[PDB]
Design a protein around this ligand. Sequence first.
Ligand SMILES: CCCCCCCCCCCC[N+](C)(C)[O-]
Ligand SMILES: CCCCCCCCCCCC[N+](C)(C)[O-]
Ligand SMILES: CCCCCCCCCCCC[N+](C)(C)[O-]
Ligand SMILES: [N]
Ligand SMILES: [N]
Ligand SMILES: [N]
Ligand SMILES: [N]
Ligand SMILES: [N]
Ligand SMILES: [N]
Ligand SMILES: [Xe]
Ligand SMILES: [Xe]
Ligand SMILES: [Xe]
Ligand SMILES: [Xe]
Ligand SMILES: [Xe]
Ligand SMILES: [Xe]
Ligand SMILES: [Xe]
Ligand SMILES: [Xe]
Ligand SMILES: [Xe]
Ligand SMILES: [Xe]
Ligand SMILES: [Xe]
Ligand SMILES: [Xe]
Ligand SMILES: [Xe]
Ligand SMILES: [Xe]
Ligand SMILES: [Xe]
Ligand SMILES: [Xe]
Ligand SMILES: [Xe]
Ligand SMILES: [Xe]
Ligand SMILES: [Xe]
Ligand SMILES: [Xe]
Ligand SMILES: [Xe]
Ligand SMILES: [Xe]
Lengths: 372, 372, 372
Amino acid sequence: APAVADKADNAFMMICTALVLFMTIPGIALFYGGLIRGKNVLSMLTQVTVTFALVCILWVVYGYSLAFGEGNNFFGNINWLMLKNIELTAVMGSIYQYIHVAFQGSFACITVGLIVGALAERIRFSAVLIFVVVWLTLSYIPIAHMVWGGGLLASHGALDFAGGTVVHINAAIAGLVGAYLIGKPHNLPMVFTGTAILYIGWFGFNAGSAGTANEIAALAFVNTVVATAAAILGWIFGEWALRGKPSLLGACSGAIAGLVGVTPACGYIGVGGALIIGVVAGLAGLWGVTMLKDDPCDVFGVHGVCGIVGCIMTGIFAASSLGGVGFAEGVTMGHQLLVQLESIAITIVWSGVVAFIGYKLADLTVGLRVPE
Amino acid sequence: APAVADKADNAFMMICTALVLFMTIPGIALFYGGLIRGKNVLSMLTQVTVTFALVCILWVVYGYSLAFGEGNNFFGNINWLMLKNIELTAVMGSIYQYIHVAFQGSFACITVGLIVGALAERIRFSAVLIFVVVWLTLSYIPIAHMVWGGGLLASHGALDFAGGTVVHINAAIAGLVGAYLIGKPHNLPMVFTGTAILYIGWFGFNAGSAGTANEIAALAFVNTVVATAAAILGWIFGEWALRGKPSLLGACSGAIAGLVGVTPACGYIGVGGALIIGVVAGLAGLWGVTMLKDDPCDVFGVHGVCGIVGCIMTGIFAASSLGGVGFAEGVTMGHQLLVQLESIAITIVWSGVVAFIGYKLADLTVGLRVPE
Amino acid sequence: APAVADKADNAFMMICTALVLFMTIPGIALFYGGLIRGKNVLSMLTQVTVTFALVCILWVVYGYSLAFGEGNNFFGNINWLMLKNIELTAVMGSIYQYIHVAFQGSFACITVGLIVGALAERIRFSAVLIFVVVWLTLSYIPIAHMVWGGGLLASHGALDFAGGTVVHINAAIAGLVGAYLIGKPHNLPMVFTGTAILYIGWFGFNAGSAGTANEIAALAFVNTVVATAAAILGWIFGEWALRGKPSLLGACSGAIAGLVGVTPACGYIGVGGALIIGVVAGLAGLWGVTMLKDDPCDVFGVHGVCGIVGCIMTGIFAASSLGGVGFAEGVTMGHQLLVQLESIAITIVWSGVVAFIGYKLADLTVGLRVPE
Ligand SMILES: CCCCCCCCCCCC[N+](C)(C)[O-]
Ligand SMILES: CCCCCCCCCCCC[N+](C)(C)[O-]
Ligand SMILES: CCCCCCCCCCCC[N+](C)(C)[O-]
Ligand SMILES: [N]
Ligand SMILES: [N]
Ligand SMILES: [N]
Ligand SMILES: [N]
Ligand SMILES: [N]
Ligand SMILES: [N]
Ligand SMILES: [Xe]
Ligand SMILES: [Xe]
Ligand SMILES: [Xe]
Ligand SMILES: [Xe]
Ligand SMILES: [Xe]
Ligand SMILES: [Xe]
Ligand SMILES: [Xe]
Ligand SMILES: [Xe]
Ligand SMILES: [Xe]
Ligand SMILES: [Xe]
Ligand SMILES: [Xe]
Ligand SMILES: [Xe]
Ligand SMILES: [Xe]
Ligand SMILES: [Xe]
Ligand SMILES: [Xe]
Ligand SMILES: [Xe]
Ligand SMILES: [Xe]
Ligand SMILES: [Xe]
Ligand SMILES: [Xe]
Ligand SMILES: [Xe]
Ligand SMILES: [Xe]
Ligand SMILES: [Xe]
């Protein structure tokens, strides 16, 4: 009767967790390190590393319990503080629950890395730590519960395979609020290296979200290859048409645009949908950083816009008629789309409000703007 | 009756695919980035990234179908365009076929990365895209079909575990033709970093070519460690004897020489053969870049020479008497050697001719030499 | 009757081996590369690469046989020279023995990389090769046999999951002897990149030491996340208190301190113990590099001190009452602690003496100090 762990899924999921951690340490740190002024690199890398450590600790102390424990529509409980009452041999799905703790913790880490990396230039160090505590505890954790922890958005059938809302939109909005409150790249080879590490790690991010080494993991893997490639080509074509030539930063940005766009969709769509989502995301990203430029190192320009596009287009290309795996029983495309839009709107407002509270608390305690 | 996927092999093979993609993004890009003039790095990285995206797309659209579909001795068919008629739960060997699509696509990517990285300095950007289409479609795909897709060379019993011909010789010849038509490293730490990433990813390349996490994967893994180490020592000893001291570029080149040499052999030989092939490859590589120097960043000097040496020596050390896994029934060492040589010759001529056609078509459409 | 390999464990363990190799190539090379004077980087990278190749070869020729073959309390035998008499399908635990050869060889590689990287600046190149042969054969191999090969320390019940003694203390002492005999960082972004690669690879190091993708691997994985995070925070808090501000080098050093401290403990302790060991290790590391500064690039300052702290605290937090997996039957905490201390003392003296012999033999043959 009691579920038994499959060692193939244990192995797959521990390695996928390592790939996701790789996305933060050193992926996103190198990505931002090549974008910001050289004089701010060391401080940014320190803030990414220290806030990464903080997230790891908060996650085990109470974050996992409040995100994935049973509670209400908005948060879980505190019955798994420091993972108490989780037996070592406890199974979640087809893997040991300890591996689920680590895999889901690694997602919290990259989400925070996306914010801290972009704002470390301008925000005070003690203030970023305050902000991380506030926003992780009151925005990442409730939103993760609502989408992946059986809460409000899951109970309405929201489709988000690997975190278009939980990770990308959530962090993009936090970044924009930060930039609004706190008013050329020097090492593009480093930007490219970070981009590449983010790409390789993202296979653990997307495919690992199946929770098992099955055909859905395989689907998500292939769709991640295709969407990324198509968004690179889409971005680069739009750059050739708009600016006359492609650029390395454009190609890297296109890759990220496709990775973000396919994040919510990868486990639900066909390879034809992945190609279309990739092209659209690459072009919407290019448009986002162009026209929509309140954007610290273009957090929203890509993660926000492409996150929204992917979440919406997931409600389309999940349809069996378009090569997807099919909507749930009794769910039309029109209904699913409405659920995707509602989920996007809730994530935007929830993250913005918590982020405003986080930055304001930091500002009233220690001051936000980096000192003298 | 119908084959069932083993989740352990699914997991193994998806992670091996990620390791192979890692070899291109950022492996080979960093390798060449430290070798070429600083003023050409950004353009090379853009060309590697964009042509990588192009290969990914062409592979799914028609490349997989024409390489691994059933057809004739030279190419497959177009029954799997955009992977149509491949059910998601379809099994190939002991893994889902979708994972086979991705794994084999990643090999096409690194093969093209080897060419583009070396020639991006001198070739026009639109011309490289034309060349990639022509050469991928008419050289990589038919040669992959002939060797790994049940075509001409497979039907004669050619031994090539992970692509001495399909990947290394194929691309080396394309590189030389390019250099013939289009007539010191500045960041050796970057060269070393690329080399190291190529090394780690190559375990997915070599061991993943078993298609399963079995004793042949384990054999290929160990032989990859041994051959690489022995070629480093071989190259470095020859450099000490010839130039008076080892160098970092020598040590990295030796590593690549051993990785290339053991590619066709790793799943067929004993560890004693891997040591011998490594030493020979390291020394043949050193000789190749010395005496044979028409060599853009030494594509053939190592990949061509060591590819040929490895393919030949596979026909020797696969013998059971030498610790190998044994030739097929009824096959003597003399016969096997002849088959290896025939396979090498066909790959050289096929790739050269297609490459000449590719570069000439680009030259007549847009012009090959990078503009003003 | 005969053991059968589990493909899930085969896959897990081959990938963990690749992650451990990643720690040396390029992990530890980049770590030291950013620490030492720019003018010595290329020579250090060459020495790390060439000695890495040497270790790989010695391991297969005789090192595996003498470390993990059956012999006496101090070394094995020479019945597995070049892995002869090891059938390809031979099983060790739940994986093919060939994979065990590679996994354990990768540990020898990182241990030597820790020494060579730190001393390459000052030691002659031919002398480091002599030293590596002597110390690998007479210190790493016997100590690995004593702890993990059924020898003296294993037979007394010493707890060392992933090599607090075999790897970290062993190499730290060899480093100090070297520095005693042979009397600011320029690229901190490179130090951070090396640190990050060491971190990701260390999951293969720690979790792979379970030999299987089971709940102990999962435990070791989570404890590695927690201990690393806590040591970062511990180090950084002590730096804030002592120096007034955190630094990037501090944050990276704290990470390494926690990784070292949890190495012997990760598979035996609860997550609460991992947090405590991480904090203590981070602070002991900070103290080590402060007060105890005979320290070439701070080998002992972190690997030695934190290795000792972790080995001792493993004898505490393995207790079931503290969340650990429990001491063996009939073993009190007091007895276990005494065994940990005895194991630490034997490793320190054994490594020091062999290291002195190694450096002296090199000095009498070729001379230790780098020439003119
Ligand atoms: C593919 C046909 C789908 C149409 C389903 C009609 C019923 C639901 C309509 C809800 C409104 C549509 N939408 C996209 C604005 O939310
Ligand atoms: C180890 C004995 C192998 C000798 C087999 C003799 C029959 C085949 C001979 C074919 C010619 C040899 N070769 C290498 C030039 O192709
Ligand atoms: C948690 C209670 C453990 C006490 C066990 C008493 C018997 C063994 C005492 C050996 C001496 C202790 N120590 C730590 C100095 O080795
Ligand atoms: N990300
Ligand atoms: N990003
Ligand atoms: N390669
Ligand atoms: N290469
Ligand atoms: N290490
Ligand atoms: N380290
Ligand atoms: Xe795996
Ligand atoms: Xe964790
Ligand atoms: Xe985590
Ligand atoms: Xe990229
Ligand atoms: Xe993956
Ligand atoms: Xe990419
Ligand atoms: Xe969503
Ligand atoms: Xe990796
Ligand atoms: Xe693909
Ligand atoms: Xe691929
Ligand atoms: Xe290397
Ligand atoms: Xe691998
Ligand atoms: Xe290497
Ligand atoms: Xe071949
Ligand atoms: Xe990996
Ligand atoms: Xe090995
Ligand atoms: Xe190894
Ligand atoms: Xe890297
Ligand atoms: Xe780090
Ligand atoms: Xe792992
Ligand atoms: Xe870290
Ligand atoms: Xe120990």
